[PDB]
Amino acid sequence: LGLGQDFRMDPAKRKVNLSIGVYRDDADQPFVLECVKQATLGTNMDYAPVTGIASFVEEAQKLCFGPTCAALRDGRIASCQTLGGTGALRIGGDLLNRFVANCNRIYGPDVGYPNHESIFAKAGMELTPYSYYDPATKGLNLAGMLECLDKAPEGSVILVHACAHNPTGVDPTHDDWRQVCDVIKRRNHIPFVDMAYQGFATGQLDYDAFVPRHLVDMVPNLIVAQSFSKNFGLYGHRCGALHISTASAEEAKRLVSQLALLIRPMYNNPPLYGAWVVSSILKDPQLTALWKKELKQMSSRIAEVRKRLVSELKACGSVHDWSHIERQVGMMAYTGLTREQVELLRSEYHIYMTLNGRAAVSGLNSTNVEYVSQAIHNVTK
Amino acid sequence: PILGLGQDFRMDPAKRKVNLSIGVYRDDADQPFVLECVKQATLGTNMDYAPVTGIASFVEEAQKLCFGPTCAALRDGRIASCQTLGGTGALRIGGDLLNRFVANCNRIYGPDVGYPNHESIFAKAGMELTPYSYYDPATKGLNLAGMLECLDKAPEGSVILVHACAHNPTGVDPTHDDWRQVCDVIKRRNHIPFVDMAYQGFATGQLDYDAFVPRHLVDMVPNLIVAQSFSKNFGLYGHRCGALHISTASAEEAKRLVSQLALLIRPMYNNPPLYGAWVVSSILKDPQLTALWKKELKQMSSRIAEVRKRLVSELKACGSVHDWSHIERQVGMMAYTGLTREQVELLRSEYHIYMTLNGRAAVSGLNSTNVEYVSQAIHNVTK
Ligand SMILES: [Cl-]
Ligand SMILES: [Cl-]
Ligand SMILES: [Cl-]
Ligand SMILES: [Cl-]
Ligand SMILES: [Cl-]
C-alpha cells in the first residue's frame, strides 16, 4: 500500500508500478472483461442465502473440479460462496481449527502469499514453512519440498498454490505434483489448495486445476479456496468459493451447515454482484466461450511480456541469466534483483517493486518494457 | 429459523397464504423495492479492490449521515471509521476490536428480547451476551425502570448494546426523553455504548431523529461504537454495505484504531465490496439524489406505520375486544404482536399465515391486498 501511495505521489513522467496486485491491459488500464460487461445481473437486491447463491456455488464447483467429477456427482463436496479467495481461506481455517484435533499449525511454502500468515493466525494456526523457492535459480526446490512434507507430522495441513505461485511465479510441473500428491496421501496430510489463478495462469482452465482435481480422489478431505478476483477480473466485488471434499453426501450436508455457523456471525450472507456475474457467464455457452478466450488473451499477454523483457535484456547487453522470468508463470515474478538493486531502480529510474525483488509483470507493457529492461540491465551489469 | 418458515411457506399449496416472517421490505404489491435514487446512482468505472477500510468517500459520507453536519468529534477527526459487510460486519469487526480500548472485555449487555445474530456475533469476538431488562410482555412495550436499574447495577465499564431505533424484533423503542435517562446512567457508570443502528431513516422517515442515540452519546462518553447498516434504508440488503464508527479522545487515537481495524479486516476478507459503497457515496454527494432518497425513505416508513394503524382498525372492525395499541406505538418493520405460541401455530395451520413462534410479525409483509384477511384471522384465534 505504501509503494502504491509513493508511486502515485512521485512526480516523474517516466514511472512504472510493478508492485500492484491487479491485472492491467497493454495501455496500463484496468480491464473489465467483455464477458463480465455482457453478464446478466439479478433483478432484486434481497439477501442471498448464508452459503451464497445456489446456482453460483454449483457452477463454482463444476469449474473447479470439472463437470465429470465423481465426488461432485455423488454430492460429497461441501461448498459455499465466500468473500473472494481470502474469505475461503479464513472460513476454511476456522473450520479446521474447530474440528481437527490439535490443528494449530499449517505448512506453506517458505516464500509465499503475505496474507496467509495472518489469515491462518486468526484461525489459531501458525504458518510454518516447507522448502519451496530456490533463490540461486529463482526456481523450485522439489527435493526439499518432498522431504519437508514427508517429515511433517502425519495429518498435517498442507497449504499449496494451485498455479501461478504468488509472489515468485514458480510452479511445480504436473509430473512434480504427482510426486507431491503421493507424499500427501501416504502421510495422511490434509491438502488446502489456494487456487487464485485458475485459467489466468496458463490460459487452460483444466490444466490449471490439475492440483485439486488430482487430489480429490486421493485423500479423504481436500480443501479448496477459489478466487474469482483475477480470472473474472472481479477483484473489488469480492467473489470466491470454498470447497471441502468429504466421504458422503450426508457428511457434506453436515459441513455446509457448520460453514453457515461460521459465516453468519462474520457477515451474515455474501455479496450478490460477483455471484450473479460468474453464475450468468458459466450458464451461458456464448459467455463461457468468450470468457475462455479472454482468459487466454490475459495469460498470453503476461507470458509474452515476460518473454519480451528477457529478449530486451539480452538486446541491452545483459550477460546475466533471465530464463527464470520466462519459466515462471503468472502475474508475479521473483526477478532475483537484490534490495540495493530494487532501491536504485526506484531512485534513479522510478520503477517500483517490493524490496524482495518481486515484480508484478502485468505492469509491464509495449509502452514501458524497453525502458524497464534498460534500467534492470543498468543496475545489474 | 426464518429459513425453514420461508421454505414451508413457498411449498404451502393454499390459495390464501401470507408470509410475516420475512426480513426484507416489500412494497404494497408485495414486491421487492429497489429505490429510484439507487437505480439513478453513478457507479464506478473499474473493479479494482477498494482500500481495506473501504472507499474513502463512502466512509466519510457514512460518518456525516450518522453523526450529522455539526459533530465536533467528526470535525476534530476523533472518530475511527471503516466500511463493513452490512451492519453484521460492523458488529463483528467492532466486537473483535473492543479489546483494544475496553478493559476485561468478556461480556456485553443487550436487551432481554433482541436481535438473534448478536449472541453468536459477540461470542465469536470472545464476549458473552448478557441480558438487561427491556421488553415487557404484559404491554408488548418498554420496561424503562428495569432497563435503568440493570444498567446502573452492571459493573462499571460494561459494554452496553442498544438498538438505535426500530428495535428488532419487537418494535419497542424508548423515547428521546427515555434515552436521556439511559444515557446519563451509561455516562455515570463509565459504560461503553455499542449502538446497532440498522434502521436510520427507515424507522420514522426522519434521519436526524432516528440517529439521536449515537449523536447524543458521542459527546458524553470517551468511546462510542456505532454499527451502521445500509441494508434497509438504501434497500441494499444483498450488496452487503455498512460502516463501523468508533469515537476516541483524539485524531492520533483514531488513527491507531483505524490501522487496527485494517488488521482485523485483511485476514477476514481483505477488502470490502464496491457496489454498495458507490451507490451510497454517489447518492449522499448529490443534492438531487439525497432529496429523492429522503422522500423514498418517508414512503417506506409511512407505509409501515399506515399498515400498522390499519391492522389495528381492522381488528376493531372485526369485533376484537382486545387492546392492539402496541401495534401502533411500536416502530419499524418488526412487531411483537403478543400472540401466544398456540395462537401463532393456529394462524399457520388454520389460516396459512406464517410468523415466528415468538409472535413476531414482519409488518412489511402486510399490505392492501392481505391486511383484512390477516386481521380477521388474528381476531378469530384471539377472541
Ligand atoms: Cl496431467
Ligand atoms: Cl510486449
Ligand atoms: Cl414504497
Ligand atoms: Cl431530542
Ligand atoms: Cl393499508
Automatic annotation (TrEMBL), chain A:
Origin superkingdom: Eukaryota
Parts of the chain that traverse the membrane: none
EC number assigned by the record: 2.6.1.1
An individual GO BP term: L-methionine salvage from methylthioadenosine
Cofactor(s) recorded in Swiss-Prot or TrEMBL: pyridoxal 5'-phosphate
Enzyme class: transferase
Gene3D superfamilies documented for this protein: Aspartate Aminotransferase, domain 1 (3.90.1150.10), Type I PLP-dependent aspartate aminotransferase-like (Major domain) (3.40.640.10)
Gene Ontology MF: a single term: L-alanine:2-oxoglutarate aminotransferase activity
InterPro entries named among the record's database cross-references: Aminotransferase_I/II_large, Asp_trans, PyrdxlP-dep_Trfase, PyrdxlP-dep_Trfase_major, PyrdxlP-dep_Trfase_small
Keyword Transferase found: yes
Domain Aminotransferase class I/classII large: 14-376
Gene Ontology CC entries for this record: ciliary plasm; cytoplasm; mitochondrion; nuclear lumen
The family this protein is said to belong to: Belongs to the class-I pyridoxal-phosphate-dependent aminotransferase family.
Subunit: Homodimer.
Alphabetized NCBIfam families for the sequence: PRK09257.1
Descriptive protein name: aspartate transaminase
Organism: Trypanosoma brucei
TrEMBL record, chain B:
Superkingdom of this protein's organism: Eukaryota
Domain Aminotransferase class I/classII large: 16-378
Keywords: Aminotransferase, Pyridoxal phosphate, Transferase
GO cellular component, one term: nuclear lumen
Entry's Gene Ontology molecular function annotations: L-alanine:2-oxoglutarate aminotransferase activity; L-aspartate:2-oxoglutarate aminotransferase activity; pyridoxal phosphate binding
Cofactor(s), names only, from the UniProt record: pyridoxal 5'-phosphate
Pfam families (alphabetical): Aminotran_1_2
Enzyme class: transferase
EC number: 2.6.1.1
GO annotation (BP), single: L-methionine salvage from methylthioadenosine
Oligomeric form and interacting partners: Homodimer.
Annotated family: Belongs to the class-I pyridoxal-phosphate-dependent aminotransferase family.
Protein name: aspartate transaminase
